Design a protein around this ligand. Structure first.
Ligand SMILES: CC(C)S[C@@H]1O[C@H](CO)[C@H](O)[C@H](O)[C@H]1O
Ligand SMILES: CC(C)S[C@@H]1O[C@H](CO)[C@H](O)[C@H](O)[C@H]1O
Ligand code: NA
Ligand code: NA
Ligand code: NA
Ligand code: NA
Lengths: 211, 211
């Protein structure tokens, strides 16, 4: 959840917002180790429920999200249903555990390609055009993350937009991402320069992946 | 419906058969002028019912078809339901009136392209990949006709097969068609040659389109 003024400005200027719970357990092995564990359900529930209690009156918020990159656990299903029960007015989405689990109203993959399948075991990233028409599938597809804009990038961005415009159920996506996470440091002359992972003696680090 | 021996050979050699009622009204304006008219229901019904009564025991027949290129009329709906009621063991398909009407279990377009939409009014031919995932659509797609093999043709055939293999619900199609409808005529030297529309003084004719 963002600084409270963010939603005020989104209401007044006009942006659709996905409001997302402060839950990410990416570094767990497997990714759902905590989110499938009932012991972690109370802590998780508060991150979801207190977000909804705070932001439910903002018109800019059109979708709730259960968080980011935490696999798919039973705790996700429980909290998905909590929101659906408490606030029928907004769909709930969540990408973890394959982007099309029982905890999401929207197929919301990250970095699924337009035409190319990536058939990873358990959590494949189907071509977005193919994903829509899989046997039994009926949901809309909106990438929670696509077009990783890291450095000299956004090659093949036009390919997404062509597909979005042609297929009714391909309803767009959220680019990753808005702003480089570089920090200002100062050299011997007091001149400012942009720094990234590792430039603060921080180790282990992931270098320029913050940009 | 074919010569009776055809089904016997398909049973024994092993080919899947679509058995099709002898109903085509292509030259009507509009195409459903007769098929939507209750006066023509009796004649149409016998073309359907007597086919089913003849061929229902052949294992090679897996799909019934209501005919060809006769638009979509209420008579098709009636006869669709008739077959479904009499023989639940085989799907019913029919392409007329846009290939995805209430008279078909299978989306069965003719010459719909792989990636290219052709948004004709009333009867659009969507790209087959796009067709599958139109809002609400759940049926399999098998082209009743595709890859028109007229003369030097089958350009782009590989594009179809790549899509068939990638998308579970694209379950193939029937090439148009098997054999040139050329006829033998004889010249002065008694030599046989291959003749097409117009070569018998037949007029109006559609020239080489029989091949
Ligand atoms: C396969 C890994 C690089 S995960 C990848 O890292 C990205 C780095 O910018 C983002 O954080 C994405 O959300 C994450 O999926
Ligand atoms: C627009 C017309 C060419 S219709 C077209 O003609 C073809 C010619 O072989 C086939 O008969 C197809 O079934 C028919 O749709
Ligand atoms: Na769209
Ligand atoms: Na990053
Ligand atoms: Na297929
Ligand atoms: Na022809």
């Amino acid at each position: 959840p963002n600084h409270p003024l963010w939603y005020t400005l989104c209401d007044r200027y006009g942006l659709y917002v996905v409001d997302e719970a402060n839950i990410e357990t990416h570094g767990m092995v497997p990714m759902n180790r905590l989110t499938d564990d009932p012991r972690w359900l109370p802590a998780m529930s508060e991150r979801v429920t207190r977000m909804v209690q705070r932001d439910r009156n903002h018109p800019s918020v059109i979708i709730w999200s259960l968080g980011s990159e935490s696999g798919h656990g039973a705790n996700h299903d429980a909290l998905y249903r909590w929101i659906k029960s408490v606030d029928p007015s907004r769909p709930v989405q969540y990408e973890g555990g394959g982007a099309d689990t029982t905890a999401t109203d929207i197929i919301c993959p990250m970095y699924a390609r337009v035409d190319e399948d990536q058939p990873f075991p358990a959590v494949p990233k189907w071509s977005i055009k193919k994903w829509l028409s899989l046997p039994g599938e009926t949901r809309p597809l909106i990438l929670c993350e696509y077009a990783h804009a890291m450095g000299n990038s956004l090659g093949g961005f036009a390919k997404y937009w062509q597909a979005f415009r042609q297929y009714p159920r391909l309803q767009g996506g959220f680019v990753w991402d808005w702003v480089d996470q570089s920090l200002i440091k100062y050299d011997e002359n007091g001149n400012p320069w942009s720094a990234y992972g590792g430039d603060f003696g921080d180790t282990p680090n992931d270098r320029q992946f913050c940009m």
